[PDB]
Design a protein around this ligand. Structure first.
Ligand code: XKM
Ligand code: XKM
Ligand code: ADP
Ligand code: ADP
Ligand code: ADP
Lengths: 743, 495
């Protein structure tokens, strides 16, 4: 039937709202705000309000867990839409707390949860349907029980809502909504999409491999630092097939004396498959099956080497998936990751500045987060916090709001009523304290990110941005033309230009335009590998890129080692280096990998191994010049955009003065102006406090006059001419001007 | 198959292993595959338990018992040979090792063609393109890829047919045209985490891709191909032909291409050890890795080793001072030590390429080692025409490009520089073609199907001679140092 679509992940946390592709709406005979009735796979029906997001395809309709398992429809299945509303808003509608969600809760939970969720929204309700409302640090779901016999009803002023109490819990047909799903993972939407695409076919349709000859993914190996959310992701995926997955987590297996483990492990495989498709999560495979190279007892060696043989047995059929988990892949015995034994590794990795924001929003979603929580600010403030840490933080703050409210309410247990738990407005002061307490001791390792900088933050460089758009973006949006001519485009760039001029910013902005996984390897990170004589770590770095593709590597200060030598003498690399040589060795390898882009930035382009400028390696050198007057205007505007500035600052003059400022120097002028602005503003707020014992709400033209006096050109003209000299060495003309193939 | 044997508690394995030998021979000739012998019989040097030592050392005694008769074969398997206890590879105990090795650019194409053979591979699958695209994919990965593509064609068709199992009919499975877009996605997903190690290959380059060098190709045909197709004449005179060459010549002039083409003409297993690969061994103070490299050649024969930038270490020293090798080096010295050993191996040919022939251990030019120095000169005008034609052969070029003039300009371009001119012409061609396809898209909101004489006019303006005349004369000076004449001109044994 054409009145059907496929359910997909929600765009918003609110329930009762369903997104439809705007082109699909009219053909579906639905309009901008109509009531979208829904008929699920089972003999189960519900209703929602229409919405639209242009990212939705005509195939997809977005429904979150509150609506999906209300139709008993797993994610990715067919939902039928049957619009036919009545005009009779519900009368005497009713609901109960017949659920385990209200364990220990006291007070009039009806007043705090149900009444605002109903009257503030005036949303459509249908009897028999479970609905989740979050607040008071609890997610409480109730099963409607009366709506009048109408197929749908909308709560309104004449809807005299009702409530009653009973002890009966949810039915077997109802999903345990207190446990995770797809919407409970925020930091790794890319890897989550990879995993769900990778295992939607075996698990949703295990027969769909049973019959055809393709061999399904028999083993997935999630990995990433502990607390990254690996077990969360596996549990979220398995909550579509949670018949027997849960009992089969295997971190305890390795620790039962001798064969008691080997027996247990067997049973773990034996019982997981016994009913429905099932996921067998080998939690902390790093411990059960470590590299045999570093074992000192045959009993543990036999444990690991009969993990493999129980793995191989599952190659016969598709309904079972062995989703392992580990801190890093090279800590496990390579006897795994064979064809059929954990064939597909997946790096969950630490969340980025926007992944942590999504994690914080996911965890806070049941807390009354107040009206001053700058989530975006803490998300950048909490760099390095791996996954579960943002979960601890979101509790450390919440508790900081309880322990500072539990003095007012002197109760000895939370038989304190839910209404005052709803009053726990967890202000940003509490989160400020919690961050000060929180420690990112899970890990802080080379971080792969989708940087949030964009062209509007790269003032000037009008030519270079075009020259990089036609270099990173043309070969990935018209590869037909690159095959038609056999070009083999350049998988490399070297930004040579004065330091502090916008090379790293350009690389981040490029990675952002393509929405690619930027991986910055700063100067100290390379120089440390050279110092420790541990150039082998480079093999790890590039490997991360090989896993993070589509990536944009970036070796900031790629000439760091050559500068830290002088480039003239040394037993070692002469002109070359340990780590630069390893970088060449790995660039040659990754020249195959079409997805990853490699960028380097050299503020000393003459002093650097010329072997890196060879074709295939960072071949396309791009000059990043000192900004000219107009580009200096652009840079000043870019840096002042994020700060309040009086409406009479003459920036076109502030650019004229800066005869040759690098971009960093103009940023430093902006920062000196800000510092002098807080000086002049603090020294008038404290003056006001003394008076009582917004002076200036913005920086002004006055403050720049003392901000500029601390200014430089961070590159002498003897360096500007050094880069011009390197350009003319690498501009490569030799009097072919006016050359023409004669007619 | 015996991968499970090592993991059954104590004697339960030792009994099982015996039964494995006992029952394999019971009917007809039978192969006994000791899967992952790396694990069952590791080097006893790195064991910490007597029971595992006894497992490995009663693998040997069950091996020996099979020397009595021929019908049973014990085909072991291992990641690498030196990880197994040398108690194996004795006479009669795994006497014959065989390196399957990673597939080459045409091996991977054959693997892909084998695995795709049941998939409706559509009409736009550039198998040859993915075969080069998928470098480093070891065997079964191309099998996973060939599934990742196929599934990418199912999961994008299973929306149309909303069935819950493949009781979907075979007819619409035949309609799963796995387009090259699906394989493009699958390659982006696929990871060659099996291994990426020094790759032995039969290169697909040939003479037609080596523009010019008409003299050098003959001089190498009579040097690598005469001693292997007329060895009667080399024994008849007792010549002991040269198992070595050093290509000294300006960098980026066609030395590695010549070596690959030579290996291809003989259909030999080329093994390139690039400059960074030697320089890495010298940095890590792990010259012992060279013993591995040459060993690969000893297993991959008929081979053509190739030490690109054989003077890499000397350049990375300056060749004047150092505690270390003075004029010599760690890794160059190890290379000499192994060249002396491999001078026995008749099948393998050893080639080196030096763009800095003066700064390199002269001990490597000794007879038996890379003795026959061959000069790889900068292309002359006709050879530049040849190089330009060779590089533009694979790309569409308008039928009015005046290549015999584009050669005249490039008074001293190396081969790499002319290839860079070709690549700049291509880059400006996509620029001018993309900027008219997007223009067409804006119009509706094949401009030029080929590069043209127009684009080379902006492609050439970014050109070099990558060697100054002070380097051309440096190589001429090294040649006259190694041309070795001293006025025996007109010398004649008088009648
Ligand atoms: C003249 N002689 C003739 C014969 C022979 N020539 C031939 O016949 O070969 C044909 C080809 C090709 C081709 C390509 F080489 C790259 C492509 O695009 C992939 C891509 N995907 N993402 C990226 S980067 C991007 C990913 C997003 C996040 C950041 C980075 N790239 C990409 C981009 C830039 C450079 N490299 C790869 C497509 C092709 F079709 C040799 C020369
Ligand atoms: C003047 N005093 C008199 C007495 C004494 N002299 C004497 O009596 O010795 C006689 C001899 C010989 C001989 C030989 F020395 C090499 C041969 O061919 C093997 C071969 N097979 N493949 C190759 S390379 C090719 C394999 C294909 C893939 C790539 C590489 N080669 C080969 C080719 C070039 C150089 N070396 C070996 C045959 C012979 F008969 C000492 C001097
Ligand atoms: N990417 C993420 N998105 C949402 N929650 C996360 C994420 N990563 C970690 N968490 C939080 O961490 C906890 C899961 O930790 P767990 O998976 O048990 O440890 P590990 O990740 O090491 O297996 C959950 O409470 C979850 O809310
Ligand atoms: N072109 C530019 N436009 C705007 N800001 C710039 C520009 N170039 C540099 N900056 C400023 O300099 C800093 C980044 O310097 P960076 O580009 O990393 O220098 P380098 O790459 O030479 O180390 C940022 O704070 C940014 O505000
Ligand atoms: N004689 C030649 N004929 C055709 N192409 C050549 C020639 N010499 C070099 N090239 C080009 O140069 C590249 C190979 O350079 P290479 O021979 O490896 O230089 P080097 O051996 O000095 O490193 C190829 O892209 C090839 O197109």
């Amino acid at each position: 039937r054409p009145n059907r679509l496929i359910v997909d992940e929600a765009i918003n946390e609110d329930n009762s709202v369903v997104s439809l592709s705007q082109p699909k709406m009219d053909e579906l005979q639905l309009f901008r705000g109509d009531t979208v009735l829904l008929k699920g796979k089972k003999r189960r029906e519900a209703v929602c309000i229409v919405l639209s997001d242009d990212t939705c395809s005509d195939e997809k309709i977005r429904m979150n867990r509150v609506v999906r398992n209300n139709l008993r429809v797993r994610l990715g299945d067919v939902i039928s839409i049957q619009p036919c509303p009545d005009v009779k808003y519900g009368k005497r509608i009713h609901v109960l707390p017949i659920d385990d969600t209200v364990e220990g809760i006291t007070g009039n939970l009806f007043e705090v949860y149900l009444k605002p969720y109903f009257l503030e929204a005036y949303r459509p309700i249908r009897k028999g349907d479970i609905f989740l409302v979050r607040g008071g640090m609890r997610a409480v779901e109730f099963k409607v029980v009366e709506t009048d016999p109408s197929p749908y009803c909308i709560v309104a002023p004449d809807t005299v809502i009702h409530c009653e109490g009973e002890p009966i819990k949810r039915e077997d047909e109802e999903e345990s909504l207190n446990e995770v799903g797809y919407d409970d993972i925020g930091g790794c939407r890319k890897q989550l999409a990879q995993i769900k695409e990778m295992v939607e076919l075996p698990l949703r349709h295990p027969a769909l491999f049973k019959a055809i000859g393709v061999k399904p993914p028999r083993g997935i190996l999630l990995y990433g630092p502990p607390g990254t959310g690996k077990t969360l992701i596996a549990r979220a995926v398995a909550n579509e097939t949670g018949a027997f997955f849960f009992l089969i987590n295997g971190p305890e297996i390795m620790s039962k004396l001798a064969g008691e483990s080997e027996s247990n492990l067997r049973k773990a495989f034996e019982e997981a498959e016994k009913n429905a498709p099932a996921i067998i999560f080998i939690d902390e495979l790093d411990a059960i099956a470590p590299k045999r190279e570093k074992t000192h007892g045959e009993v543990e060696r036999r444990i690991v080497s009969q993990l493999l043989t129980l793995m191989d047995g599952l190659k016969q059929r598709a309904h079972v998936i062995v989703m392992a988990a580990t801190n890093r892949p090279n800590s496990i015995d390579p006897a795994l990751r064979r064809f059929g034994r954990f064939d597909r590794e997946v790096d969950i990795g630490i969340p980025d500045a926007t992944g942590r924001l999504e994690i914080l929003q996911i965890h806070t979603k049941n807390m009354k987060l107040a009206d001053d929580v700058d989530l975006e600010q803490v998300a950048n403030e909490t760099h390095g916090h791996v996954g579960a840490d943002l979960a601890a933080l979101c509790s450390e703050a919440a508790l900081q709001a309880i322990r500072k409210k539990m003095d007012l309410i002197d109760l000895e247990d939370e038989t304190i009523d839910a209404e005052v738990m709803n009053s726990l407005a967890v202000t940003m002061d509490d989160f400020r304290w919690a961050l000060s307490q929180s420690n990112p001791s899970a890990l802080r390792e080379t971080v792969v990110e989708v940087p949030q900088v964009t062209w509007e933050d790269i003032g000037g460089l009008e030519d270079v941005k075009r020259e990089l758009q036609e270099l990173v973006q043309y070969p990935v949006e018209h590869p037909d033309k690159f095959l038609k001519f056999g070009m083999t485009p350049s998988k490399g760039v070297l930004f040579y230009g004065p330091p502090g001029c916008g090379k790293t910013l350009l690389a981040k902005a490029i990675a952002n335009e393509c929405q690619a996984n930027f991986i910055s390897i700063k100067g100290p990170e390379l120089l440390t590998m050279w110092f420790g004589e541990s150039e082998a770590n480079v093999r790890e770095i590039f490997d991360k890129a090989r896993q993070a593709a589509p990536c944009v590597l970036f070796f900031d200060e790629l000439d760091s080692i050559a500068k830290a030598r002088g480039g003239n003498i040394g037993d070692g690399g002469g002109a070359a280096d340990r780590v630069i040589n390893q970088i060449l060795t790995e660039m040659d390898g990754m020249s195959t990998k079409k997805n990853v882009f490699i960028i380097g930035a050299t503020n000393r382009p003459d002093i650097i191994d010329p072997a890196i400028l060879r074709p295939g390696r960072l071949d396309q050198l791009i000059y990043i010049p000192l900004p000219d007057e107009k580009s200096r205007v652009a840079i000043l505007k870019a840096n002042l955009r994020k700060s309040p500035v009086a409406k009479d600052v003459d920036l076109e003059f502030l650019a004229k003065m800066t005869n040759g400022f690098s971009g960093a120097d103009l940023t430093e002028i902006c920062q000196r102006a800000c510092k002098l602005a807080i000086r002049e503003s603090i020294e008038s707020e404290i003056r006001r406090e003394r008076e009582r014992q917004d002076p200036v709400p913005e920086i002004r033209r006055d403050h720049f006059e003392e901000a500029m006096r601390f200014a430089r050109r961070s590159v002498s003209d003897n360096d500007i001419r050094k880069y011009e000299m390197f350009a003319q060495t690498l501009q490569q003309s030799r009097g072919f001007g006016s050359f023409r193939f004669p007619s």
